[PDB]
Structure 1
Amino acid sequence: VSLQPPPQQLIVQNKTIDLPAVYQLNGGEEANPHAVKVLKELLSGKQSSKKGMLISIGEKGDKSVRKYSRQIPDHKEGYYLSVNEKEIVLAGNDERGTYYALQTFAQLLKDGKLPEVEIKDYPSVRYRGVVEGFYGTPWSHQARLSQLKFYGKNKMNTYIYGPKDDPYHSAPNWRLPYPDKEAAQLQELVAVANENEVDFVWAIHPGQDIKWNKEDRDLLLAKFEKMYQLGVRSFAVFFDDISGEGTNPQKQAELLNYIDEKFAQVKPDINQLVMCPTEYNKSWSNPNGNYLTTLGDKLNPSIQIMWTGDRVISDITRDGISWINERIKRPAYIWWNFPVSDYVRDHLLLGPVYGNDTTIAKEMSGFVTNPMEHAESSKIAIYSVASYAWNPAKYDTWQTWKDAIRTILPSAAEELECFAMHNSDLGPNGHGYRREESMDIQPAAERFLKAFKEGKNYDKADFETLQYTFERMKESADILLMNTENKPLIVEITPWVHQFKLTAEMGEEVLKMVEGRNESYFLRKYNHVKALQQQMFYIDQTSNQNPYQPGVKTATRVIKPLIDRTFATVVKFFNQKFNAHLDATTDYMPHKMISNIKNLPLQVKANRVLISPKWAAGNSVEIELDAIYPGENIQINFLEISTDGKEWKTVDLKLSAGLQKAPVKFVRFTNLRQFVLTIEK
């Protein structure tokens, strides 16, 4: 088996022992009852009695396992697991340890058969898990219930609740208790987290409008107190992405220490207390100021401080963690902003987890991932982060990705792999963060395109690889659409699956245009491609219509540019050959734009028509829409309207011109970061 996470020490013998038909259970009444419940499910159908094979379960100190005390590792959440033909031992250093032994035990089980094996295990990082900390639609209740079962299975002990658009988490209603319905749901979440050995850390994000007074201090404590009554035993205060007084390091420290002394140390049973600083990565840290060393010196040392790395989106390196730890005077609690896609919402990020140093476990208090608003889809990265964080020294990126996918979707693992490996890069974005994509076919794609562009003979093998890949892509899309094993996963990814299928069909038809040996056939494929472009645009305009990066982009890094440039090239070649004037545009645009900028394409985004973001006065620009619409405004960062081209009407900027529902078809500007017409849909 590929045990995930991989244990710290494992010795296996070529000898299997059947899951005994007859077992004596020793320590079921004293061991972690969440661990016992898991064992008893694994043993349904088998007989209990005082005869037959002994199964020893308990926490170090319990009589059930005092026998094995010096084999039980002396770490938080550590365990000893042993299988031989005589007996089974499942012995945690603590209750969570025992639960974790059962999670490893369940993976060892196959057909009703166990390998003869000896395991001593424990996590290299103390706090491991997920921070629901993104902008966008927060995870549904059902998605959260499923997350927490998944965290228990992969030994993640931490779930930090902090969805930026939950109004009771953030400003201004952080001051209000949750309504009954949500409160009842959070209470269930906390109970379920408890059953899966996950710390539910409730975060609050009061900083944008906090006053540094008695009144807001008390409301914050009253809100924590409410959460505590709901079952919450860990807490966080986040000061990220704010301006104003709330950024004050002295005051933040004083408030966290107050929470610490008057609440966290006064209750009998509060576990983590965590804060997110305002300077939460090195690039936003101001060496002109003293923000981080002030937190470092003033914040009670048991309080965690979160950190995203050298940048808002970054991977964690030795130099980076060393840089921060020196300032905050404790090991940073890593907030890793992957696979969060809230700033590239038209991309799914389903690639492997990589780039984080595997030797620096001792330098971090915790490691949590900030995932996508697509909960199930995020499990690929989550499963992987759990593997990494439990045993970084043995972290195998690619094998963990595969095991993740095979866990999440066993009936269609190879199809999900196919889809995921072409849906991993983020594309260009303000943070500069990129991931690999489509790496297996990138060299064949690069050689083919350079040869074809230059009139040299492409390698046949390269052409067949591209063919194979498009074929595989369609099979994967089609199978994934109908898969019923993980319906919520398929709901999340479906718009991208449709777009991926179309991408593959377009690719096939373009390769037929390359090989095409007569005019007529070439023309049929050309027209087919144009129709597929238009379908891609339709999906782009009707799926995933969020306000920030609407639409659906897929296979962007390698596959789409290859198809686009191949199509442009072969149409150029066809035009030269047949003295024809076929249009070589690669993305369908129903509206037109002319200028003297010329080839900055237009884009449609919701009810906006914009020029893709050059200060020469060549003289004019005109946009023609495909119909008459009521106009809202025109926005510009470094002007007339018409319905027919002939009668015009000047509008005055400010830069922003209101149109006041004036019918618009044409827009002209005479005498660029932004140039956007908003119309009424």
Structure 2
Amino acid sequence: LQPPPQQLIVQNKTIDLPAVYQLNGGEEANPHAVKVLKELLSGMLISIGEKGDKSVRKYSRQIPDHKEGYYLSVNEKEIVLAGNDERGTYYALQTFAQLLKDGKLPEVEIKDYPSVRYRGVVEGFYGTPWSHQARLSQLKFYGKNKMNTYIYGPKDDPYHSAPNWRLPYPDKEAAQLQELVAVANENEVDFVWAIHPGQDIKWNKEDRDLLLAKFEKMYQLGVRSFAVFFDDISGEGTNPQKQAELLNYIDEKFAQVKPDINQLVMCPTEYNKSWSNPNGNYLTTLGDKLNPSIQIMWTGDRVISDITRDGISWINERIKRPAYIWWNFPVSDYVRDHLLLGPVYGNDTTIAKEMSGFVTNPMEHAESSKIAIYSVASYAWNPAKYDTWQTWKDAIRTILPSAAEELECFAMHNSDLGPNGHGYRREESMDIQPAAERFLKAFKEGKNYDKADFETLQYTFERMKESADILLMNTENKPLIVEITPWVHQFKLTAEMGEEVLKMVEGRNESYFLRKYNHVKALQQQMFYIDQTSNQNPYQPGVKTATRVIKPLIDRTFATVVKFFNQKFNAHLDATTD
């Protein structure tokens, strides 16, 4: 079960999904939840509803008193799916669908609710914006994983940024947004429309209600949640009193005047500790003057950082509310030549009460981002039960059941950022790291390497090639495969290089060695070709893979083995990989 319930009792028996059922509550439970339920089955009583519905009266003491909470029960005589509110019943069904395997249900009893109020994704990365279809797919994935939040803002959409923010959406674009909003609604996600006025806004009555008027227009289109960004604001616009006053005005005239506005969030100009002036008074001012119903976004101690108890105390003390965390992972828009497919880890698991929200900023690779996104959904719903490694594997098995082992193999070796401008790193290839390290230490001093570590490495390379070739031809998730194809090609080429280098280590004779050596040089050059021709971008063009442990192991083994050959046969073979 992902995310894992707050409370779960499994009774060790298993019942059949009823051949014949009595559906009680179908006309008064959340229609989004009923829709899912009716999809799941084509007599035994099944009761669906929210606290206060007639249909769930019997079980209202079992329904948790938390927003988005629910009670779920399965046993011999009946099935209960009962939310504390509408979204909660929908969340009951997302768990129910995960329990239902081969027409059979386990006998269980669940009491569940989220530890973090707002959970989901911010579309805030640089690079090729996601397509329309990518976003419809993301929205459905958020619903399944009980993420309640999507902060919109594609960079090819000019009507949320300076200067066309003042201007309303054109007809054809409007209807597309409208489709996003509708799909979000259906999946119980708050479509949060973010405005980015900072670049060209003035503190005067005119810009003041061009914003209001814009929000109203967005309201007519179905938008029920809103964000305002000040990260990019300049000059007098960095005044926290002026910012507070604008947002409070938006709160007073709009958020509190409308019946059904959910989220209202702002991004401050000081959005991490290291970009905060110690002598200034930006955040305390903002925290004193901003209405209490308005969230303040925060990335932690640095632009890229994992959230700690000290970090969250330091900010919460100043804005006088629990920070709304923006986590800059797996976003790779500053290491564009890397894919970040590793586990999600580093965030403190005891600090749920200290955060109002937790949203991840993903990659420009929408589908490849689902691994971290699923993990974040799991962390933010139940941090205290959060299992990094198990959640990673579940995500992979969920995203690509037909080739889960292959995707795991691939992702294990595509997780580190490599060295970069934020100094942010992730672990990679941990499984084979000790075998690598030993081999490298031993071999380098003509002191025998272990046969078992040689075999581990051989085994790895063989497995990488199989994984790579299976992944290329996989048709269960074509969008995913299209995103990762350049890296998969490069990852395969890496595996081949490693195999040929290991045949150089086992050097049989002079002729065979030179054959292997020429093949490695040719393979290097194919890697360079892909790096010069795929994923070209002004910032970090190209395709890097297996960069933490595996490629340095291969480069060094190659450099070393060529050195020994130059010594033994008086040759001058090039020993570089550069």
Tell me the TM-score range normalised by the shorter chain: over 0.9
In 2, the alpha carbon distance for the partners of 1:62 and 1:455 equals: 77
Where 2:160 maps in the other structure, the secondary structure is: coil
Greater relative contact order (Cα < 8 A, sep 6+)? 2
Structure 1 residues 500 and 241, CA gap change in structure 2 (3 angstroms): farther
Of residues 370, 394, 417, the one that matches 1:426 is: 417
Whether the aligned pair in 2 keeps the contact of 1:208 and 1:244 (CA below 8 Å) is: no
How far apart are residue 258 of structure 1 and its match? 1.1
Structure 1 residues 216 and 249, CA gap change in structure 2 (3 angstroms): same
1:316-367, CA deviations, whole angstroms, 9 ceiling, x for partnerless residues?
1111001000000000010011000111111000000000011010000011
1:539-596, CA deviations, whole angstroms, 9 ceiling, x for partnerless residues?
111111111111011111111111111111111111111111111120xxxxxxxxxx
In 2, the alpha carbon distance for the partners of 1:110 and 1:85 equals: 17
Structure 1 equivalent of residue 554 of structure 2: 563
How far apart are residue 241 of structure 1 and its match? 4.1
1:77-113, CA deviations, whole angstroms, 9 ceiling, x for partnerless residues?
1100000110000000000010000000000001111
Where 2:199 maps in the other structure, the secondary structure is: coil
How far apart are residue 452 of structure 1 and its match? 1.1
Where 2:72 maps in the other structure, the secondary structure is: strand
In 2, the alpha carbon distance for the partners of 1:532 and 1:177 equals: 53
How far apart are residue 242 of structure 1 and its match? 4.3
Structure 1 equivalent of residue 308 of structure 2: 317
After TM superposition, list the pairs within 5 Å mapping 1:105-120 onto structure 2: 105-120=96-111
In 1, the alpha carbon distance for the partners of 2:566 and 2:444 equals: 15
Structure 1 equivalent of residue 376 of structure 2: 385
How many residues in Structure 1 have an aligned counterpart in Structure 2? 577
Whether the aligned pair in 2 keeps the contact of 1:168 and 1:176 (CA below 8 Å) is: yes
TM-score by length of 1: 0.84
1:583-632, CA deviations, whole angstroms, 9 ceiling, x for partnerless residues?
1120xxxxxxxxxxxxxxxxxxxxxxxxxxxxxxxxxxxxxxxxxxxxxx
Moved more, 405-414 or 250-259: 250-259
Of residues 30, 33, 49, the one that matches 1:32 is: 30
How far apart are residue 248 of structure 1 and its match? 1.9
In 2, the alpha carbon distance for the partners of 1:507 and 1:139 equals: 35
How far apart are residue 303 of structure 1 and its match? 0.1
In 1, the alpha carbon distance for the partners of 2:549 and 2:206 equals: 55
In 2, the alpha carbon distance for the partners of 1:451 and 1:167 equals: 58
Structure 1 residues 164 and 299, CA gap change in structure 2 (3 angstroms): farther
Structure 1 equivalent of residue 292 of structure 2: 301
How far apart are residue 267 of structure 1 and its match? 1.6
Instruction: Please say if 1:292 is aligned against 2:283.
Output: yes
In 2, the alpha carbon distance for the partners of 1:491 and 1:182 equals: 26
1:179-231, CA deviations, whole angstroms, 9 ceiling, x for partnerless residues?
22221110000000000000000001111221112222222222222211111
1:267-321, CA deviations, whole angstroms, 9 ceiling, x for partnerless residues?
2211100001111011111111110001100100100000001110000111100
Whether the aligned pair in 2 keeps the contact of 1:209 and 1:246 (CA below 8 Å) is: no
1:403-459, CA deviations, whole angstroms, 9 ceiling, x for partnerless residues?
000000000000000000100000111111100000011111111111111111111
Where 2:198 maps in the other structure, the secondary structure is: coil
How far apart are residue 243 of structure 1 and its match? 3.7
In 1, the alpha carbon distance for the partners of 2:346 and 2:527 equals: 33
Where 1:432 maps in the other structure, the secondary structure is: coil
Instruction: Please say if 1:193 is aligned against 2:184.
Output: yes
Whether the aligned pair in 2 keeps the contact of 1:333 and 1:367 (CA below 8 Å) is: yes
Moved more, 217-226 or 425-434: 217-226
In 1, the alpha carbon distance for the partners of 2:442 and 2:539 equals: 39
In 1, the alpha carbon distance for the partners of 2:418 and 2:213 equals: 44
Structure 1 equivalent of residue 495 of structure 2: 504
Percentage identity across aligned positions? 100
Structure of greater Rg = 1
Whether the aligned pair in 2 keeps the contact of 1:344 and 1:426 (CA below 8 Å) is: yes
Moved more, 344-353 or 251-260: 251-260
How far apart are residue 14 of structure 1 and its match? 1.5
In 1, the alpha carbon distance for the partners of 2:296 and 2:399 equals: 32
In 2, the alpha carbon distance for the partners of 1:570 and 1:165 equals: 50
Structure 2 equivalent of residue 183 of structure 1: 174
In 1, the alpha carbon distance for the partners of 2:520 and 2:170 equals: 52
Moved over 4 A (4+): none
Q: Greater share of helix residues, 1 or 2?
A: 2
Structure 2 equivalent of residue 257 of structure 1: 248
> Unpaired runs of 5+ in structure 1?
46-52, 587-681
After TM superposition, list the pairs within 5 Å mapping 1:369-380 onto structure 2: 369-380=360-371
How far apart are residue 245 of structure 1 and its match? 2.9
Where 1:357 maps in the other structure, the secondary structure is: coil
Where 2:42 maps in the other structure, the secondary structure is: coil
How far apart are residue 164 of structure 1 and its match? 4.7
> Unpaired runs of 5+ in structure 2?
none
TM-score by length of 2: 0.99
Whether the aligned pair in 2 keeps the contact of 1:207 and 1:247 (CA below 8 Å) is: no
Structure 1 equivalent of residue 72 of structure 2: 81
Where 1:208 maps in the other structure, the secondary structure is: helix
How far apart are residue 172 of structure 1 and its match? 2.5
Where 2:121 maps in the other structure, the secondary structure is: strand
In 1, the alpha carbon distance for the partners of 2:519 and 2:510 equals: 14
Whether the aligned pair in 2 keeps the contact of 1:200 and 1:234 (CA below 8 Å) is: yes
How far apart are residue 67 of structure 1 and its match? 0.5
